[PDB]
C-alpha cells in the first residue's frame, strides 16, 4: 500500500486570485490520529470554489480548493473507528464533531470546528498535510478534494454504501443537499404553497425538486439564462420567469402574480440586488424568505426593519440544514432506494485534468455540473 | 335613547404633531351595519401611540388616538351577530376579518383590514364617525380609543368574560398580548432556552412573563433605565443587564455571558440600534431574533447577509402572533382562570382628562402601564 508513506500525487493548487489552475506535482502526508487518508474517483464543482478564484469569499493562498466529492479511503490514522481501508466514504464541508453547542442541538448543524467563520487554511490540528515545490499548501473547508488524494479530519467523512456510484453520489456532498435541504428542512414548505427559487443552478434546481417533494402547488422558477428553464420545469417548475422581460422589478411582477406573495423564496445566486428581491416578494404577513447563496466578502444590505414587522421570516442556513455526518448517509441510502435521481444535474462530465474547462462552463451557463473524474 | 343617533362626548384630539392633545367635544356618529359603538371604561396608554405624537408613526391628522382598551357594547348596528348591548368588549387594533388569505392561513395574522399598512383612518369602508367643530376627525388603527364612546368594526371586536375587572384585563388590548404571544407564538421559546430581552416597559416585561411560561431556563433583562430592574427579576429574569456600566459593547458582553449568544432575542422598543445589537446578541448558528418594537419612519439598518448564512433567524409580528379576534378572549378567560396577574405592570390610573400628564409619566421612565378611567 502507499501506508505511512508520504503520497506524492497531482492536485490544482491556485497560487493566487483571479488566475488559473496550476495541476501541480504535491506530498500528501500520512494521516495523523483522528485522520483519514482518501483516494478521489470524482468531483463536483460547486460555485463557491469559484468565489475563492474570483476574490469574493476569502481564505489564505495557496490552496488546493474542492469540497462535493467521493472517493475511497487510503489509510485511516490511529484511533479513527467509524471507517475501515476501502471504505467508499464522502468528505464534508462542515463537520459533525458530535460534542459541541450546535452540534448536541437537533436543529443546528453549523458546527464549531468549521473553517468558514474565521479561515485557518489548515486542518483542525492547525496543521497543513501538502506540499508542492518545498513549499507549505493550505487546505480549503478542511476537504481540499481537488487532488487525487486528501487528509481530512474523521469528524469530516461520512461512509456511504458500498454500491453507490461515486461518480453521481458526489452532489449529495454539498449541491444536491444543500439546495434540498434548503427547501425541506430550512424553511420546511408545506404541502398546496407557493415558492419562488432564484437560481437555477446545480444548488438551484435541488431546492426546485425539494419544494415539489414538500408538496408545493407552485414552483416559479426565476434565472436571467433562459436556456436552464426546461430542465427546472422537468424537474418540478410550474413557471419560469426571466428578469430581463419586463420593464417592472421582479419582485412586484412576483407579488401581483401571486396575491401578494410566494410564501417561501429562495435565493439560490449570491447577488446583493437578488437577495433584497427574494425578501421583498414573499408575502409580508406569511411569508419565509431563505438565503441559500454566498454574498460578497464584506457587502451589506440596507433593509428598512418594517418589512420584518408585519410577519416575514428570513434566515439562511449552511448544508441544507443538514448535521452532515448523520444528514448525508441516510440521503445516499435514499438514492439506492430510487427515490430521487441526479441525472438531469449532472450535464457533463471532464477528467481532472481539464478542471480549468470545467470552471470556463460555468461562466458560459453552459453546465448544471460539471463532474471531474480522477 | 342614545342608540341610533349622534353622541357629543369629550375627547382627546390630536391636532398637530409634538403638539398637547386637546379635550375637545365630538359627534361620534351612530354605528353603520356591521360595526359597534362602544362605551369607554378604561384605556392603556401604549408607546405606539406616542410615535404618532412624536412624527415618527405617520397617519392623517387631525385623529383620535388610542388601541389598548376595555368598554360595555353600546349600540350595534344592523347585521351584528357577535355582541349584544351590555356585554363587555375589548377593541381590537388588527381585525380578524375571518375571509382574507393571511385569516385563512393558520400561521399569519395581519390581517388585511388593518390600517397601518398605508392609514387610511377611517372605519373599514373610507368613511370617518367623529366630527368636532364642524370639522371631520380621523380614526386611528379603527379603534380610537381616546374617546367617551367609539364606533368600531365588528371583526374588530372581541367579546370577554362578563366578570372582567375592565381595568386590568385592557392590557390584554396589546401590551400583554404582543410581549407574551411575541415569546409563545412568534419566537416559540423553549424548554431549557436562554433568552435576553431589550426595554423592559410594559410590553417587554410581558415578553419576560412569556420567556418564563415558555421555560426559558435563563432570562436576561437589558435596559438604560435602571429602576426597571426589581419588577423584571419579580416577573422572571435571572439577570438585569445595563448598557451604560460596560465599556464594552452589548452584544460582546452578552455573548461572552452565554458561550456564544442567546438562543432567542427580543428586542421591544423600537430604536435601530438595539435591533442590529440584538441580532448579534443571538448565537450565529442557531439563535432567532425577534423585532417587537416598532423602527421610527425610513430609518434602515445595514446588515451583512453572511450574518444569516450560518443559521439565524430574523422575524417581526404585530400582536404577538394573536389572531385577534379569538386570542384575546382566550387569554381574558386565562386570566380569569387565575392563570397570572397584570397588577405588576399597572403603575398609575388617572381619569381621562389627565391624558397629557399621562404621556408625560411615560417620558420620565417613573411609569411602565398607565390606565385613564371613564
Ligand atoms: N449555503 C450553502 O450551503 C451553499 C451555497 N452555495 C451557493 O449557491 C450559489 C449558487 O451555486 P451553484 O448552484 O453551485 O452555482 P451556479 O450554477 O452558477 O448557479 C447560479 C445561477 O444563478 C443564475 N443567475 C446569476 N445571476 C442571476 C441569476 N439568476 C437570476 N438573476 C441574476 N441576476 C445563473 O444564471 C446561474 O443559473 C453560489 O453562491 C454558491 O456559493 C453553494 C453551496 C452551498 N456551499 C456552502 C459552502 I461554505 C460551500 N458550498
Ligand atoms: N409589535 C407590536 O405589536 C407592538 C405593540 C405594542 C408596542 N409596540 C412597540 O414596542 C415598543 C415598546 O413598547 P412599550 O409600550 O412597552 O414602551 P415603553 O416606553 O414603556 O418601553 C421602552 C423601554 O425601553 C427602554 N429603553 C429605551 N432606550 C433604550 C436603550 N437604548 N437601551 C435599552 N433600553 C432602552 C426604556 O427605558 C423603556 O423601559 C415601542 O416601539 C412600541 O411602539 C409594538
Ligand atoms: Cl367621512
Ligand atoms: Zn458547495
Ligand atoms: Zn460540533
Ligand atoms: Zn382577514
Ligand atoms: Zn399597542
Not at 449541491?175 to 428542512?185: C, E
Not at 449570491?270 to 464584506?298: F, K, N, Y
Not at 428570513?314 to 441525472?343: C, N, Q, R, T
Request: glycine share 10%; net charge positive.
Amino acid at each position: 500500500s502507499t501506508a505511512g508513506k508520504v503520497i506524492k500525487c497531482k492536485a490544482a493548487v491556485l497560487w493566487e486570485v483571479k488566475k488559473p489552475f496550476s495541476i501541480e506535482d504535491v506530498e500528501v502526508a500520512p494521516p495523523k490520529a483522528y485522520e483519514v487518508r482518501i483516494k478521489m474517483v470524482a468531483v463536483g464543482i460547486c460555485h463557491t470554489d469559484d468565489h475563492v478564484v474570483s476574490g469574493n469569499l476569502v481564505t489564505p493562498l495557496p490552496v488546493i480548493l474542492g469540497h462535493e466529492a467521493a472517493g475511497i479511503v487510503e489509510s485511516v490514522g490511529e484511533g479513527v473507528t467509524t471507517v475501515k481501508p476501502g471504505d467508499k466514504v464522502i468528505p464534508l464541508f462542515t463537520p459533525q464533531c458530535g460534542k459541541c453547542r450546535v452540534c448536541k442541538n437537533p436543529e443546528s448543524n453549523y458546527c464549531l470546528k468549521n473553517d468558514l467563520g474565521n479561515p485557518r487554511g489548515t486542518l483542525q490540528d492547525g496543521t497543513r498535510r501538502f506540499t508542492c515545490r518545498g513549499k507549505p499548501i493550505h487546505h480549503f473547508l478542511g476537504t481540499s478534494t481537488f487532488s487525487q488524494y486528501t487528509v481530512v479530519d474523521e469528524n469530516a467523512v461520512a461512509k456511504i454504501d458500498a454500491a453507490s456510484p461515486l461518480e453521481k453520489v458526489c452532489l449529495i456532498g454539498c449541491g444536491f443537499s444543500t439546495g434540498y435541504g434548503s427547501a425541506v428542512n430550512v424553511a420546511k414548505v408545506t404541502p398546496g404553497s407557493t415558492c419562488a427559487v432564484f437560481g437555477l443552478g446545480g444548488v438551484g434546481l435541488s431546492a426546485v425538486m425539494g419544494c415539489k417533494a414538500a408538496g408545493a402547488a407552485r414552483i416559479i422558477a426565476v434565472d436571467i439564462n433562459k436556456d436552464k428553464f426546461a430542465k427546472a420545469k422537468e424537474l418540478g417548475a410550474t413557471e419560469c420567469i426571466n428578469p430581463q422581460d419586463y420593464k417592472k422589478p421582479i419582485q412586484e411582477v412576483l407579488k401581483e402574480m401571486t396575491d401578494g406573495g410566494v410564501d417561501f423564496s429562495f435565493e439560490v445566486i449570491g447577488r446583493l440586488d437578488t437577495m433584497m428581491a427574494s425578501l421583498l416578494c414573499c408575502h409580508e404577513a406569511c411569508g419565509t424568505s431563505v438565503i441559500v447563496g454566498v454574498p460578497p466578502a464584506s457587502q451589506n444590505l440596507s433593509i428598512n426593519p418594517m418589512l420584518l414587522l408585519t410577519g416575514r421570516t428570513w434566515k439562511g442556513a449552511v448544508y441544507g440544514g443538514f448535521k452532515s455526518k448523520e444528514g448525508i448517509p441516510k440521503l445516499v441510502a435514499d438514492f439506492m432506494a430510487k427515490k430521487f435521481s441526479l441525472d438531469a444535474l449532472i450535464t457533463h462530465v471532464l477528467p481532472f485534468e481539464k478542471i480549468n474547462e470545467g470552471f470556463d462552463l460555468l461562466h458560459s451557463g453552459k453546465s448544471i455540473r460539471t463532474v471531474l473524474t480522477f
